[PDB]
């Protein structure tokens, strides 16, 4: 494509998980002939710049969708100019966030281009990329040094540019020979790491580097040369090795991503020169990673001092190892992903093969340099064992290094304990699908028997009343009585008594009104019973769709809808704790049913404290409330009695959820302690306070999202390793059990984010239920009684325009009810699936936003029809801006009008009976079960995730949606049809300074107890004790950021996967 | 034969449906007394009902169709073309309020939905600002988008009989139908529509039901979002 | 011929007219007499077999001023 070899560094801004099109802009650059060093999402300026300067790129592409873009790009321009990167051009995404004034401001500041959506429609998507790629079509070898003085001195920016000249072959021959002469005299070890594609080389390399740093106290200068294959046709390349490296962010670590620039070889054609360049730069160790090579490859061997073959337990038969050329030269062999099935057996086959290749029959196979590692696991002892081995090898390879600080332990095999879903239970989703289908087979069988029993006894009476009698009929009828189950027989027996119950004006100690009378005088019954005469139809209906509040709870989990509380629960989250608390009081104004829904800013969502640094500062307060300390949390819910039975608090938080939950619990407790110090005019005693805290935990109502699994399925907002988050999430659930927290739900299992990514209703429902069942299987494998954690499970679904949405809730309820009763044998409280429905954000369009209220009304209606437990209605202008004041009342009026004015809604089961509803229910349910089977044959949710099945399927359904939408096949009123002939088309500066002031004040107040508490927290993780229990005390003297980063030091950060 | 203006005067759905069908049958009896054949004028009969928020509106069309179909076949012995009652539904003008006129689009959507569910022959959707000023070109597009979105985007509407089977629908259908018949009997024992009109029975009954609506609306008993509850803090206009 | 099915984005086939799956011939006859399919006596579910697949004829209501101004608006809208 271009003239020179153009290299880019692409990333999403800090705390910004918006990677929807950063996967597509990388595709285009790779198909125009650019080498893109992709850094993924959630990147600080310091990270992107350090990457750009080392990779020595011509351009940088950043996509900022969370705001705070101005401060971010200004910082990047400043930091670039300061450290010799002023010739690097910075570009901005085509998002509709950066307004025209902010574009001209940044473009004048130093930013190359910031493409407006106006440029999107005009230039085209490929058009913008083409323009951007042509601007960066410059030669960088003219910035390269002509003498080795700067590079040898230690200047890394000179090293990075010297490499560019060598990679392009634009370096003077006399300079190259002097470089190799300097490298030979340097005498530094070069470690080669090769293996198949995706084996975990980059991940393991990162972990090994981490080991080096911790073991030698960052005293070692390590250079890293990673190589990824380049597309033959284009000439460009995808260099996705840096995106894995979490331990290279240090002045002593240097990394350069090289393209093969050959359609065959696995290493760079200029690898020997690039290595010699790093050796001469006085590095202590040089590490080289090759690309995905076949079995018969070993090109890395002559260029390095030591070689490490990385592989997975999946290599087929044992005889295949006799084909792997690299098993003949490898000084070390790492069988990574030792968490997978057959890892143990894989280790012995390889050990025996290496033993044969080396002809060391005088030794044990367990003494071979074959290790079993799990790089995905934080502080994996397996990786450390491999590290210990490598050091000893490099030690005699002429490398001075201090005695280790790491545990010099022994063994070859990883002793992984992170057991989530045991391989024996791998097919759990399939078993569940079998259980539901088994239930339906019984429904048919029993229904047929109930009919035959009735048909006989009826015909017998007709004969006996006509004179002649045939008692033979009774014999067959009595045979049906034994055939009919004890449960089914009781159902038909209670049916007449059931009709008498739902017939009167009251449902009779306690009484409940059954009838609401209209203006016309008509009596509308809350629950309408069928008038079937056939006992086959009665039994069939009673088993498949009973009345609300009876198994399988298809029509709802409760007998009747609650009077005091509507399902309404509206979002709120803006600026600091004070402004949001004002919005909370305004939404709950004049309502006994105080049900709050909290939204946190991107800073809090990633478990970070607000800071002066332009990366974070610009994001504090946007898109959500900034909560950093327990004091902020107290202000957030001041004036509300969290313990009050009519008050429930919802809050959307995932990664840092256990910390936020801990703050909420302390807030709820302190409310009652303050209530006691007021009502009694004295502080409660040691005994009194204990009784208070206990009562608070039991009665506190609310819900925290904390769906970690959904984060590694699209939204990418994960800050902890999935295994660690699941451990702590389990720690939470155990804490709830021990203190009888019966009214708080530990997890709102989301599918909204999934549906927002383009997933059709069936896939959304199927994945969410699957992810829900994964949690169940996880806690069961841990050792929890099903009745202990199942009632604490919440759900979160997205509605929409698709027909399947009308029966989403009822299907979710029945699948849950049946499986929880039959498969897991749980009580009635566990069989009841409670969920929240929020209307489709993907159905709200930017064109003709007034039409959105029509769509949100229809979605709210079926939600209420299908007896949802909680409903949030979107404002019409959410497609363009944030929910305003006038707009949030129109969104709230939708629920109010339906619940109060709409006549059909006076009935609480208007869906039941409908031939369409029941057929759709049957259809959708089966479709979900089949999806359960597809996930189960991939190894369950976790298994499918390692391939990216969910994310892959979602992305497929998204493109299908957008295709038909643009095609006009799928009509969208106001967008692709019925277009308007006339018209073609968030946080105070004080509030930010407030949060900083409050934070530094909080830190000062607990300056003494801070460290001792954080240390206690880390020790809890090391000793595998309950983490949440410590968090209940930690949030009192430690801030959000302090806690998160303490856990980082001991729990590890999420590695950017795919 | 229209019942929109009747409903507009405050008449509840049952009285509206009952009077309109009654007035329709009066025409039939009138033309029959002139000695005309039933199959000659019955297919030329069109109806016009008002929808609204009341539950009975969800089954107004289906009840009107069955009462017509059965009577035209059994009582008057007319052909299939005569047994088919066609009608036009316009949303409630009564349900459109002057306070918070943006909320009216919500109400008009719900009324348009049950109208289309119940297989109406013709539908007119009111603009949100018709409560106050004359409908703007923009306001009339929001009213037109309601029908467009339901007919095109709304998934349940892809099915043409989503009402059928529903235990609520069938019970309401049975209830409403009977209530209408009883009203037929009250008018008949007054001498038919013409006879009742002589005593101002219809006018009288409508005015009674209107005051009952106003009484409950003013009372707060009958909640109206934006009017007698959830009122706008910033100001009444 | 007339299409009975409209397929969704998910692939689900939504039938225009959904029939009951009753086994009791008492329920069948009862349903057939009280609420038959659309376009069959007593036409409870509608007088026509299926809804008109053609776009709904947007009525054009004009009437203000004298005969000339109304005639113009008629001609303009019905262009
Ligand atoms: C990307 C941006 C969008 C987002 O991410 S927003 C996501 C955040 N989360 C949300 O919006 C929704 C939060 N989730 C929740 O509130 C809950 O999980 C849930 C289940 C949906 C709703 O819970 P609640 O409304 O509080 O109701 P509840 O089940 O906790 O009630 C507790 C006890 O009250 C009683 N009750 C409530 N309704 C009743 C009825 N109709 N009949 C009889 N009894 C009833 C009942 O005793 C119940 O206790 P129990 O069930 O017997 O143990
Ligand atoms: C007036 O008049 C009416 O009330 C109203 C509702 C405004 C219009 O009703 P329509 O009878 O449909 O007016 P039209 O002139 O378009 O009728 C023309 C002929 O088409 C027929 N038709 C309309 N919709 C149909 C359907 N869904 N399936 C089968 N046939 C249908 C209709 O029968 C009429 O034929 P015909 O003149 O009665 O013989
Ligand atoms: N289940 C599991 N996955 C791992 C493990 N180690 C690495 N991975 C993942 O395997 C993928 C490929 O690893 P990668 O670092 O890219 O190796 P490379 O392609 O050879 O550079 C990444 O998504 C890693 O997160 C492990 O020990 N277990
Ligand atoms: Mg890699
Ligand atoms: Mg590589």
CSV table of N, CA and C in Angstrom, one decimal, chain A residues 540-648:
chain,number,residue,atom,x,y,z
A,540,UNK,N,-52.3,-30.3,31.8
A,540,UNK,CA,-51.3,-29.8,30.9
A,540,UNK,C,-51.0,-28.4,31.2
A,541,UNK,N,-52.0,-27.6,31.4
A,541,UNK,CA,-51.9,-26.2,31.7
A,541,UNK,C,-51.3,-26.0,33.1
A,542,UNK,N,-51.7,-26.8,34.1
A,542,UNK,CA,-51.2,-26.7,35.4
A,542,UNK,C,-49.7,-27.1,35.6
A,543,UNK,N,-49.2,-27.9,34.6
A,543,UNK,CA,-47.8,-28.3,34.7
A,543,UNK,C,-46.9,-27.4,33.9
A,544,UNK,N,-47.5,-26.8,32.8
A,544,UNK,CA,-46.7,-26.0,31.9
A,544,UNK,C,-46.7,-24.5,32.2
A,545,UNK,N,-47.9,-24.1,32.6
A,545,UNK,CA,-48.1,-22.7,33.0
A,545,UNK,C,-49.2,-22.5,34.1
A,546,UNK,N,-48.8,-22.8,35.3
A,546,UNK,CA,-49.7,-22.6,36.5
A,546,UNK,C,-50.0,-21.2,36.7
A,547,UNK,N,-50.9,-20.9,37.7
A,547,UNK,CA,-51.2,-19.5,38.1
A,547,UNK,C,-49.9,-18.9,38.6
A,548,UNK,N,-49.9,-17.5,38.7
A,548,UNK,CA,-48.7,-16.8,39.2
A,548,UNK,C,-48.5,-17.2,40.7
A,549,UNK,N,-47.3,-17.6,41.0
A,549,UNK,CA,-46.9,-18.0,42.4
A,549,UNK,C,-47.1,-19.5,42.7
A,550,UNK,N,-47.1,-20.2,41.6
A,550,UNK,CA,-47.1,-21.7,41.7
A,550,UNK,C,-46.3,-22.4,40.6
A,551,UNK,N,-45.7,-23.5,41.0
A,551,UNK,CA,-44.8,-24.2,40.0
A,551,UNK,C,-45.4,-24.5,38.7
A,552,UNK,N,-44.7,-24.3,37.6
A,552,UNK,CA,-43.3,-23.8,37.5
A,552,UNK,C,-43.2,-22.3,37.5
A,553,UNK,N,-44.1,-21.6,38.0
A,553,UNK,CA,-44.0,-20.1,38.1
A,553,UNK,C,-43.9,-19.4,36.8
A,554,UNK,N,-44.5,-20.0,35.7
A,554,UNK,CA,-44.3,-19.4,34.4
A,554,UNK,C,-44.9,-18.0,34.3
A,555,UNK,N,-46.1,-17.9,35.0
A,555,UNK,CA,-46.8,-16.6,35.0
A,555,UNK,C,-46.3,-15.7,36.1
A,556,UNK,N,-45.2,-16.0,36.7
A,556,UNK,CA,-44.7,-15.2,37.8
A,556,UNK,C,-44.4,-16.0,39.1
A,557,UNK,N,-43.5,-15.5,39.9
A,557,UNK,CA,-43.1,-16.2,41.1
A,557,UNK,C,-43.9,-15.9,42.3
A,558,UNK,N,-44.7,-14.8,42.2
A,558,UNK,CA,-45.5,-14.3,43.3
A,558,UNK,C,-47.0,-14.5,42.9
A,559,UNK,N,-47.8,-14.8,43.9
A,559,UNK,CA,-49.3,-15.0,43.7
A,559,UNK,C,-49.9,-13.8,43.1
A,560,UNK,N,-49.6,-12.6,43.6
A,560,UNK,CA,-50.2,-11.4,43.1
A,560,UNK,C,-49.1,-10.3,43.1
A,561,UNK,N,-49.3,-9.3,42.2
A,561,UNK,CA,-48.4,-8.2,42.1
A,561,UNK,C,-48.5,-7.3,43.4
A,562,UNK,N,-47.3,-6.8,43.8
A,562,UNK,CA,-47.2,-6.1,45.1
A,562,UNK,C,-47.9,-4.7,45.0
A,563,UNK,N,-48.6,-4.3,46.0
A,563,UNK,CA,-49.3,-3.1,46.1
A,563,UNK,C,-48.4,-1.9,46.3
A,564,UNK,N,-47.6,-1.9,47.4
A,564,UNK,CA,-46.8,-0.8,47.7
A,564,UNK,C,-45.7,-0.4,46.8
A,565,UNK,N,-45.1,-1.5,46.1
A,565,UNK,CA,-44.0,-1.3,45.2
A,565,UNK,C,-44.3,-1.7,43.8
A,566,UNK,N,-44.2,-0.8,42.9
A,566,UNK,CA,-44.2,-1.1,41.4
A,566,UNK,C,-42.8,-1.6,41.1
A,567,UNK,N,-42.7,-2.3,39.9
A,567,UNK,CA,-41.4,-2.8,39.5
A,567,UNK,C,-40.4,-1.7,39.1
A,568,UNK,N,-40.9,-0.5,39.0
A,568,UNK,CA,-40.2,0.7,38.6
A,568,UNK,C,-38.9,0.9,39.5
A,569,UNK,N,-37.8,1.0,38.8
A,569,UNK,CA,-36.5,1.3,39.5
A,569,UNK,C,-35.6,2.1,38.6
A,570,UNK,N,-35.6,3.4,38.7
A,570,UNK,CA,-34.9,4.2,37.7
A,570,UNK,C,-33.5,4.6,38.0
A,571,UNK,N,-32.7,4.6,36.9
A,571,UNK,CA,-31.3,4.9,36.9
A,571,UNK,C,-31.0,6.3,37.4
A,572,UNK,N,-29.8,6.5,38.0
A,572,UNK,CA,-29.3,7.8,38.4
A,572,UNK,C,-27.9,7.7,38.8
A,573,UNK,N,-27.1,8.7,38.3
A,573,UNK,CA,-25.7,8.7,38.6
A,573,UNK,C,-25.0,9.8,37.8
A,574,UNK,N,-24.7,10.9,38.5
A,574,UNK,CA,-24.1,12.1,37.9
A,574,UNK,C,-23.2,12.9,38.8
A,575,UNK,N,-22.0,13.3,38.4
A,575,UNK,CA,-21.2,14.1,39.3
A,575,UNK,C,-20.7,13.4,40.6
A,576,UNK,N,-20.7,14.1,41.7
A,576,UNK,CA,-20.3,13.6,42.9
A,576,UNK,C,-21.5,13.0,43.7
A,577,UNK,N,-21.2,12.5,44.9
A,577,UNK,CA,-22.3,11.9,45.8
A,577,UNK,C,-23.4,12.8,46.1
A,578,UNK,N,-23.1,14.1,46.2
A,578,UNK,CA,-24.2,15.1,46.6
A,578,UNK,C,-25.2,15.3,45.5
A,579,UNK,N,-24.7,15.5,44.3
A,579,UNK,CA,-25.6,15.7,43.1
A,579,UNK,C,-26.4,14.5,42.8
A,580,UNK,N,-25.9,13.3,42.9
A,580,UNK,CA,-26.6,12.1,42.7
A,580,UNK,C,-27.7,11.9,43.8
A,581,UNK,N,-27.3,12.2,45.0
A,581,UNK,CA,-28.2,12.0,46.1
A,581,UNK,C,-29.4,13.0,46.0
A,582,UNK,N,-29.2,14.1,45.3
A,582,UNK,CA,-30.3,15.0,45.0
A,582,UNK,C,-31.2,14.5,43.9
A,583,UNK,N,-30.6,13.8,42.9
A,583,UNK,CA,-31.4,13.2,41.8
A,583,UNK,C,-32.1,12.0,42.4
A,584,UNK,N,-31.6,11.3,43.3
A,584,UNK,CA,-32.2,10.1,44.0
A,584,UNK,C,-33.5,10.6,44.7
A,585,UNK,N,-33.4,11.7,45.4
A,585,UNK,CA,-34.6,12.3,46.1
A,585,UNK,C,-35.6,12.8,45.2
A,586,UNK,N,-35.2,13.2,44.0
A,586,UNK,CA,-36.1,13.8,43.0
A,586,UNK,C,-36.9,12.7,42.3
A,587,UNK,N,-36.3,11.6,42.0
A,587,UNK,CA,-37.0,10.5,41.4
A,587,UNK,C,-37.9,9.8,42.4
A,588,UNK,N,-37.4,9.7,43.6
A,588,UNK,CA,-38.2,9.0,44.7
A,588,UNK,C,-39.2,10.0,45.3
A,589,UNK,N,-39.2,11.2,44.8
A,589,UNK,CA,-40.1,12.3,45.4
A,589,UNK,C,-41.6,11.9,45.3
A,590,UNK,N,-42.2,11.8,46.5
A,590,UNK,CA,-43.6,11.5,46.6
A,590,UNK,C,-43.9,10.0,46.3
A,591,UNK,N,-43.0,9.2,46.7
A,591,UNK,CA,-43.1,7.7,46.4
A,591,UNK,C,-42.8,6.9,47.7
A,592,UNK,N,-43.7,6.1,48.1
A,592,UNK,CA,-43.4,5.1,49.2
A,592,UNK,C,-42.4,4.0,48.7
A,593,UNK,N,-42.6,3.7,47.4
A,593,UNK,CA,-41.8,2.7,46.8
A,593,UNK,C,-40.4,3.3,46.3
A,594,UNK,N,-39.5,3.5,47.3
A,594,UNK,CA,-38.2,4.0,47.0
A,594,UNK,C,-37.3,3.0,46.5
A,595,UNK,N,-37.1,2.9,45.2
A,595,UNK,CA,-36.3,1.9,44.6
A,595,UNK,C,-35.2,2.6,43.7
A,596,UNK,N,-34.0,2.7,44.2
A,596,UNK,CA,-33.0,3.4,43.5
A,596,UNK,C,-32.1,2.6,42.6
A,597,UNK,N,-31.5,3.2,41.6
A,597,UNK,CA,-30.6,2.5,40.7
A,597,UNK,C,-29.4,3.4,40.4
A,598,UNK,N,-28.2,3.0,41.0
A,598,UNK,CA,-27.0,3.8,41.0
A,598,UNK,C,-26.1,3.5,39.8
A,599,UNK,N,-25.6,4.6,39.2
A,599,UNK,CA,-24.7,4.4,38.1
A,599,UNK,C,-23.3,5.1,38.4
A,600,UNK,N,-22.2,4.4,38.3
A,600,UNK,CA,-20.9,4.9,38.7
A,600,UNK,C,-20.1,5.3,37.5
A,601,UNK,N,-19.2,6.3,37.8
A,601,UNK,CA,-18.4,6.8,36.7
A,601,UNK,C,-17.3,5.8,36.4
A,602,UNK,N,-16.7,5.9,35.2
A,602,UNK,CA,-15.7,5.0,34.7
A,602,UNK,C,-14.5,4.8,35.6
A,603,UNK,N,-14.2,5.8,36.4
A,603,UNK,CA,-13.1,5.8,37.4
A,603,UNK,C,-13.5,4.8,38.5
A,604,UNK,N,-14.7,4.9,39.0
A,604,UNK,CA,-15.1,4.0,40.1
A,604,UNK,C,-15.4,2.6,39.5
A,605,UNK,N,-15.8,2.5,38.3
A,605,UNK,CA,-16.1,1.2,37.6
A,605,UNK,C,-14.8,0.4,37.5
A,606,UNK,N,-13.6,1.0,37.5
A,606,UNK,CA,-12.4,0.3,37.4
A,606,UNK,C,-11.7,0.3,38.7
A,607,UNK,N,-12.4,0.6,39.8
A,607,UNK,CA,-11.9,0.5,41.2
A,607,UNK,C,-10.7,1.5,41.4
A,608,UNK,N,-10.8,2.7,40.8
A,608,UNK,CA,-9.7,3.7,41.0
A,608,UNK,C,-10.2,4.9,41.8
A,609,UNK,N,-9.3,5.5,42.5
A,609,UNK,CA,-9.6,6.8,43.1
A,609,UNK,C,-9.4,7.9,42.1
A,610,UNK,N,-10.1,9.0,42.2
A,610,UNK,CA,-10.0,10.2,41.4
A,610,UNK,C,-8.6,10.8,41.6
A,611,UNK,N,-8.0,11.3,40.5
A,611,UNK,CA,-6.7,11.9,40.6
A,611,UNK,C,-6.5,13.1,39.7
A,612,UNK,N,-5.5,13.9,40.0
A,612,UNK,CA,-5.1,15.1,39.2
A,612,UNK,C,-4.7,14.8,37.8
A,613,UNK,N,-4.1,13.6,37.6
A,613,UNK,CA,-3.6,13.2,36.3
A,613,UNK,C,-4.7,13.2,35.3
A,614,UNK,N,-4.4,13.9,34.2
A,614,UNK,CA,-5.4,14.2,33.1
A,614,UNK,C,-6.1,13.0,32.5
A,615,UNK,N,-5.4,11.8,32.7
A,615,UNK,CA,-6.0,10.6,32.3
A,615,UNK,C,-7.3,10.3,33.0
A,616,UNK,N,-7.3,10.5,34.4
A,616,UNK,CA,-8.4,10.1,35.2
A,616,UNK,C,-9.3,11.3,35.5
A,617,UNK,N,-8.7,12.5,35.7
A,617,UNK,CA,-9.4,13.7,36.1
A,617,UNK,C,-10.5,14.0,35.2
A,618,UNK,N,-10.3,13.9,33.9
A,618,UNK,CA,-11.3,14.2,32.9
A,618,UNK,C,-12.5,13.3,32.9
A,619,UNK,N,-12.4,12.2,33.6
A,619,UNK,CA,-13.4,11.1,33.6
A,619,UNK,C,-14.2,11.1,34.9
A,620,UNK,N,-13.7,11.8,35.9
A,620,UNK,CA,-14.3,11.8,37.2
A,620,UNK,C,-15.6,12.6,37.2
A,621,UNK,N,-16.7,11.8,37.3
A,621,UNK,CA,-18.0,12.4,37.4
A,621,UNK,C,-18.9,12.3,36.1
A,622,UNK,N,-18.3,11.9,35.0
A,622,UNK,CA,-19.0,11.7,33.8
A,622,UNK,C,-19.6,10.3,33.8
A,623,UNK,N,-20.8,10.1,33.2
A,623,UNK,CA,-21.4,8.8,33.0
A,623,UNK,C,-21.7,8.1,34.3
A,624,UNK,N,-21.6,8.7,35.4
A,624,UNK,CA,-21.9,8.1,36.7
A,624,UNK,C,-21.3,8.9,37.9
A,625,UNK,N,-21.8,8.5,39.1
A,625,UNK,CA,-21.3,9.1,40.3
A,625,UNK,C,-19.9,8.7,40.7
A,626,UNK,N,-19.1,9.6,41.2
A,626,UNK,CA,-17.8,9.3,41.6
A,626,UNK,C,-17.8,8.9,43.1
A,627,UNK,N,-17.7,7.6,43.4
A,627,UNK,CA,-17.6,7.2,44.8
A,627,UNK,C,-16.2,6.5,45.1
A,628,UNK,N,-15.5,7.2,46.0
A,628,UNK,CA,-14.1,6.7,46.2
A,628,UNK,C,-13.9,6.2,47.7
A,629,UNK,N,-14.7,6.8,48.6
A,629,UNK,CA,-14.6,6.4,50.0
A,629,UNK,C,-15.9,6.1,50.6
A,630,UNK,N,-15.9,5.4,51.7
A,630,UNK,CA,-17.1,5.1,52.5
A,630,UNK,C,-17.9,6.4,52.8
A,631,UNK,N,-17.2,7.5,53.0
A,631,UNK,CA,-17.9,8.7,53.3
A,631,UNK,C,-18.7,9.2,52.1
A,632,UNK,N,-18.1,9.0,50.9
A,632,UNK,CA,-18.8,9.3,49.7
A,632,UNK,C,-20.1,8.5,49.5
A,633,UNK,N,-20.0,7.2,49.9
A,633,UNK,CA,-21.1,6.2,49.8
A,633,UNK,C,-22.2,6.6,50.8
A,634,UNK,N,-21.8,7.1,52.0
A,634,UNK,CA,-22.8,7.6,53.0
A,634,UNK,C,-23.6,8.8,52.5
A,635,UNK,N,-22.9,9.7,51.9
A,635,UNK,CA,-23.5,10.9,51.3
A,635,UNK,C,-24.5,10.5,50.2
A,636,UNK,N,-24.1,9.5,49.4
A,636,UNK,CA,-24.8,9.0,48.2
A,636,UNK,C,-26.2,8.5,48.6
A,637,UNK,N,-26.3,7.9,49.8
A,637,UNK,CA,-27.6,7.3,50.2
A,637,UNK,C,-28.1,8.0,51.5
A,638,UNK,N,-27.7,9.2,51.8
A,638,UNK,CA,-28.1,10.0,52.9
A,638,UNK,C,-29.6,10.3,52.8
A,639,UNK,N,-30.4,10.2,53.8
A,639,UNK,CA,-31.8,10.6,53.8
A,639,UNK,C,-32.6,9.3,53.5
A,640,UNK,N,-32.0,8.3,52.9
A,640,UNK,CA,-32.7,7.1,52.7
A,640,UNK,C,-32.4,6.1,53.7
A,641,UNK,N,-33.4,5.4,54.2
A,641,UNK,CA,-33.2,4.3,55.2
A,641,UNK,C,-33.0,3.0,54.4
A,642,UNK,N,-31.8,2.6,54.3
A,642,UNK,CA,-31.4,1.4,53.5
A,642,UNK,C,-32.0,0.1,54.1
A,643,UNK,N,-32.2,0.1,55.4
A,643,UNK,CA,-32.7,-1.0,56.1
A,643,UNK,C,-34.2,-1.1,56.1
A,644,UNK,N,-34.9,0.0,55.7
A,644,UNK,CA,-36.3,0.1,55.6
A,644,UNK,C,-36.9,-0.9,54.6
A,645,UNK,N,-37.9,-1.7,54.9
A,645,UNK,CA,-38.5,-2.7,54.1
A,645,UNK,C,-39.0,-2.2,52.7
A,646,UNK,N,-39.3,-0.9,52.6
A,646,UNK,CA,-39.8,-0.4,51.4
A,646,UNK,C,-38.7,0.3,50.6
A,647,UNK,N,-37.5,0.1,50.9
A,647,UNK,CA,-36.3,0.7,50.2
A,647,UNK,C,-35.3,-0.3,49.8
A,648,UNK,N,-35.1,-0.4,48.5
A,648,UNK,CA,-34.1,-1.2,47.9
A,648,UNK,C,-33.2,-0.5,47.0
